[PDB]
Design a protein that fits this description.
The complex is a heterotrimer of chains A (222), B (214) and C (553). Chain A contains no helices and 19 strands. Chain A is an all-beta fold. In chain A, a hairpin with a 7-residue loop joins β5 and β6. The radius of gyration of chain B is 23 Å and the shape is elongated. Classes of the chains: A mainly beta (222), B mainly beta (214), C mainly beta (553). Chain C: It comes from Homo sapiens. Chain C: It is found in: Cell membrane; Cell projection, Ruffle membrane.
Chain lengths: 222, 214, 553
């Protein structure tokens, strides 16, 4: 079976350089034309370049020619993609597809390694509780949650009462702010009859930052 | 460069209906058009090549058509597995450009959200900034406009939204509008409110929040 | 021809042990590069192996097992690549070589310097000396982390010390000319290969096994590709680009990739691809077509590929070993078969494991339209009610891209057929032919076996057949009406090349034009009956053609 695995993804400063690899297997390497495609987060697809295993003649895109550099290593069925002078627009997932015949359509895409570029450093998430208001009852149901703020980089995993409560939890996708830092909200709906009885804790886990700060959620004394 | 445009950019349909998606180019790409499919988070897969031929290993519920500048991807019968984004692409001439995407999602009836307002915490007054949340929950369809107000006047350029993915149990969305202004800008007004308008709401409910008794 | 396809046969026993040394010689004679595996198995003690003196490069692995020969003359072999390995781990395998006593005595690989990928396996050799005195790390590539040494040192005889004139003790033989040329562990600096200790003596980055100078056109072997003496990294492209508009313009210096060398065109039996690769099978959404001259080419197709038939080893039959009654219906009306065709003993009788019906002799009529096989043909069993292979009359060419046991393209074993059966077989693209151990088999030496082959490495191996003296003394001796005594079997049919005239599929004499009820017209010595319903004649040509206007009235 044909399967492709990418590598080389990570986080670099603007202007930094990376080199993505894409190892192939399950088919004759020197028989098909190999490609790289990218997709910006929440955006469409954009073909990047084109390499030939036998001759090495690479076909780039006009918006990428000069910055990127393709290579082929038939000794280990590996592709190389040298990215130079990365700007803030080069944050996306980089696929690795292949041509059937050298007409530019794809059938067997890779996995989609992620490349992100930003000048923000690593900062822990500052968890901020949202206490339910005195008028937060919708008819017998209330809401509460915590707020992670100014954390980098993605992702962060949030848990309630050590994972015991998972019915009614809504974790919102992270949204990038104007300051270059991420922030998402996690909330859960609880019936209003049990508010001063359950001790609610939000468990935010930041793996790149090694943070395990917990913050209790108590109703506000309005 | 060729602009590869799909229409519509979003579509809702029930299992068993007929789905029609149209793609259009700005140049003669008569039979150099393919089609793809991307579920959220996984890599795309080929469906149609030469705009009328299926790829090996693809079900028979797919029939491309159209030549010249008009193209169409059609599914005769829907199954709970093909709810994803469908792209169109041209390879007839350099450069090779994909479309913008077409999202096909399950349809159900209209559901009204539960609007909420959250006073900002106390540990963040000393930080320097303030944040107020306008939580929505369990609404459908996805379209919903949320705007804030500072005692008389709507704000702009300071509210970032976030909507979760679809739900596999009740198929409703959740929206959270996060106002962001500094603490110095916070301790000078009294009423902070956010306005929520939805198709399923006959009245534009508003959740007023008071900077005083809290 | 210096490009010879190797054999694919492991420790498995040969088909015919008598015609085995005659199979190795007819395949590695006058060859320098082996596009496959070099396997030297089951050789008698007094066998002569002087035909292996000119082997230099091996693409696959080297297998030397189950031999009693005292010396293997492979003294001029430099690089073994290792594209495919033995047990997916080894590139050189010397096993079970033992019984004045017989067995292998010395390795005798004096120029081995580069193993790109794989390992070495030497086990169970009692008469082999000097097997553990070689610094095998030098011969292994710099980019080879798979280099594992598995050397057995159980010896039944006492060894001699290496020649004193050798610097250290790394020798492949007792004579003075048997030292080892250290190449990689003596280099100065970051030189992968060097002909000496001086940095100026370092080899080019494209040198594989060594160099005779500092240039890039004198490497002992080309690491990536051989561009007519230039060790390059890629073959020149078949097309050039405007690099601004990126248009396609053909390049007069376009070369094709064929193993480890750049070629102007793919070989006779291979296929050329638009990407620039000499293939034996076209890639996906490609198609195999014949050019105007008659060469083979893999060419693209916008429309989906036409439905083609597949044999053993191909798309959905990669593991079937013989044609049973389950897959016999697949080859229905196939004018071409992509793959091989094998008939094992377990084909014409049912398998107890499953509910497989046996092959009835009347089921084999589906092959009465087959005209081309891209693989081998292997018939080791045949019904006794069928006297020959007359079901393959229309089989014209056996290309032999896939070879049974890696060497044979047409094998018949224990059939008991009458003469041959194969009428219209006119071309064997590659691989030898092995027709042996058939007791009732006449008409073997009377086949134009030189007019069917296509390269000097093809031959015919036959033994233990019906004696020729008994064949001639029965009245079966290529009925004289066949031209130049080339016949396929008894009868007016089975003439390879007709002498006077044809009437259908049988060789005949002067047509019945002047004294036949149907009046005929001779077109290239072909009697063809036409009904003369215009004017009954008694000795004159009636019709010029089959149309009504050409008729006499």
């Amino acid at each position: 079976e044909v399967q492709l695995v990418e590598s080389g993804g990570g986080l670099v400063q603007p202007g930094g350089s990376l080199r993505l690899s894409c190892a192939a297997s399950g088919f004759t390497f020197s028989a098909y034309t190999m490609d790289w495609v990218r997709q910006a987060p929440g955006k469409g697809l954009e073909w990047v370049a084109d390499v030939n295993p036998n001759s090495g003649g690479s076909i780039y895109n006009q918006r990428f020619k000069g910055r990127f550099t393709l290579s082929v290593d038939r000794s280990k069925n590996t592709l190389y993609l040298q990215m130079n002078s990365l700007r803030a627009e080069d944050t996306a997932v980089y696929y690795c597809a292949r041509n059937l015949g050298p007409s530019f359509y794809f059938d067997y895409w890779g996995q989609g390694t992620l490349v992100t570029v930003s000048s923000a450093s690593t900062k822990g998430p500052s968890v901020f509780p949202l206490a339910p208001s005195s008028k937060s009852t919708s008819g017998g149901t209330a809401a509460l949650g915590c707020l992670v703020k100014d954390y980098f980089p993605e992702p962060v995993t949030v848990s309630w009462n050590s994972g015991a409560l998972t019915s009614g939890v809504h974790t919102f996708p992270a949204v990038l702010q104007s300051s270059g830092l991420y922030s998402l909200s996690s909330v859960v709906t609880v019936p209003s009859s049990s508010l001063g009885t359950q001790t609610y804790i939000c468990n935010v886990n930041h793996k790149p930052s090694n943070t395990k700060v917990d913050k209790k959620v108590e109703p506000k004394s309005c | 460069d060729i602009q590869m445009t799909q229409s519509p950019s979003s579509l809702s349909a029930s299992v068993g209906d007929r789905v029609t998606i149209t793609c259009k180019a700005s140049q003669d790409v008569s039979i150099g058009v393919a089609w793809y499919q991307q579920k959220p988070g996984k890599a795309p897969k080929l469906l149609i090549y030469s705009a009328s031929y299926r790829y090996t290993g693809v079900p028979s519920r797919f029939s491309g058509s159209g030549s010249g500048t008009d193209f169409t991807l059609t599914i005769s019968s829907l199954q709970p597995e093909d709810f994803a984004t469908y792209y169109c692409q041209q390879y007839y001439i350099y450069p090779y450009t994909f479309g913008q995407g077409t999202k096909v999602e399950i349809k159900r009836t209209v559901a009204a959200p539960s609007v909420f307002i959250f006073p900002p915490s106390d540990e963040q007054l000393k930080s320097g900034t303030a944040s107020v949340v306008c939580l929505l929950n369990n609404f459908y369809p996805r379209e919903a406009k949320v705007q804030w107000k500072v005692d008389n006047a709507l704000q702009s350029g300071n509210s970032q939204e976030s909507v979760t993915e679809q739900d596999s149990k009740d198929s409703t969305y959740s929206l959270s509008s996060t106002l962001t202004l500094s603490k110095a800008d916070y301790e000078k007004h009294k009423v902070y409110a956010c306005e929520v308008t939805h198709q399923g709401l006959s009245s534009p409910v508003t959740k007023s929040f008071n900077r005083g008794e809290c | 021809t210096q490009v010879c396809t190797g054999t694919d046969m492991k420790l498995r026993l040969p088909a015919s042990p008598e015609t085995h040394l005659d199979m190795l010689r007819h395949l590695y004679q006058g060859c320098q590069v082996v596009q496959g595996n070099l396997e030297l198995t089951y050789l008698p003690t007094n066998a002569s192996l002087s035909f292996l003196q000119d082997i230099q490069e091996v693409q696959g692995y080297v297998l030397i097992a189950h031999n009693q020969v005292r010396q293997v003359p492979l003294q001029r072999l430099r690089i073994v690549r290792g594209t495919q390995l033995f047990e997916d781990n080894y590139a050189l395998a010397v096993l079970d070589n033992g019984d004045s006593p017989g067995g292998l005595r010395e390795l005798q690989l004096r120029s081995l310097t580069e193993i790109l990928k794989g390992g070495v396996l030497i086990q169970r050799n009692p008469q082999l000396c000097y097997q553990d005195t070689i610094l095998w790390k030098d011969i292994f590539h710099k980019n080879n982390q798979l280099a594992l040494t598995l050397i057995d040192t159980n010896r039944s005889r006492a060894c001699h010390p290496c020649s004193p004139m050798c610097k250290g003790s790394r020798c492949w033989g007792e004579s003075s000319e048997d030292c080892q040329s250290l190449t990689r562990t003596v280099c100065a600096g970051g030189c992968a290969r060097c002909k000496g200790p001086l940095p100026t003596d370092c080899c080019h980055e494209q040198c594989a096994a060594g160099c005779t100078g500092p240039k890039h056109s004198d490497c002992l072997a080309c690491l990536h590709f051989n561009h007519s003496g230039i060790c390059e990294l890629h073959c020149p492209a078949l097309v050039t680009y405007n690099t601004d508009t990126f248009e396609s313009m053909p390049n007069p210096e376009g070369r094709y990739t064929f193993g480890a060398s750049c070629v102007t065109a793919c070989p006779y039996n291979y296929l050329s691809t638009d990407v620039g690769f000499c293939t034996l099978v076209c890639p996906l959404h490609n198609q195999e077509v014949t050019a105007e001259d008659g060469t083979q080419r893999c060419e693209k197709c916008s429309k989906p590929c036409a439905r083609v038939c597949y044999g053993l080893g191909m798309e959905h039959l990669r593991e079937v070993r013989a044609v049973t009654s389950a897959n016999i219906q697949e080859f229905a009306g196939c004018k071409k078969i992509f793959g091989s065709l094998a008939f094992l003993p377990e084909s014409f009788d049912g398998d107890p494991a499953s509910n497989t019906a046996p092959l009835q002799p009347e089921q084999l009529q589906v092959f009465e339209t087959l005209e081309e096989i891209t693989g081998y043909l292997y018939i080791s069993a045949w019904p006794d009610s069928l006297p020959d292979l007359s079901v393959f009359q229309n089989l014209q060419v056996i290309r032999g891209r896939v070879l049974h046991n890696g060497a044979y393209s047409l094998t018949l074993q224990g059939l008991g057929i009458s003469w041959l059966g194969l009428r219209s077989l006119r071309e064997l693209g590659s691989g030898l032919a092995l027709i042996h151990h058939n007791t009732h088999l006449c008409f073997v030496h009377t086949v134009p076996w030189d007019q069917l082959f296509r390269n000097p490495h093809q031959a015919l191996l036959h033994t233990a057949n019906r004696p020729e003296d008994e064949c001639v003394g029965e009245g079966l001796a290529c009925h004289q009406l066949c031209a130049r005594g080339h016949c396929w079997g008894p009868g007016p049919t089975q003439c390879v090349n007709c002498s006077q005239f044809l009437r259908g599929q049988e060789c005949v004499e002067e047509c019945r034009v002047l004294q036949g009820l149907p009046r005929e017209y001779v077109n290239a010595r072909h009697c063809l009956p036409c009904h003369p319903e215009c004017q009954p004649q008694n000795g004159s040509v009636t019709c010029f053609g089959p149309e009504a206007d050409q008729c006499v009235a």
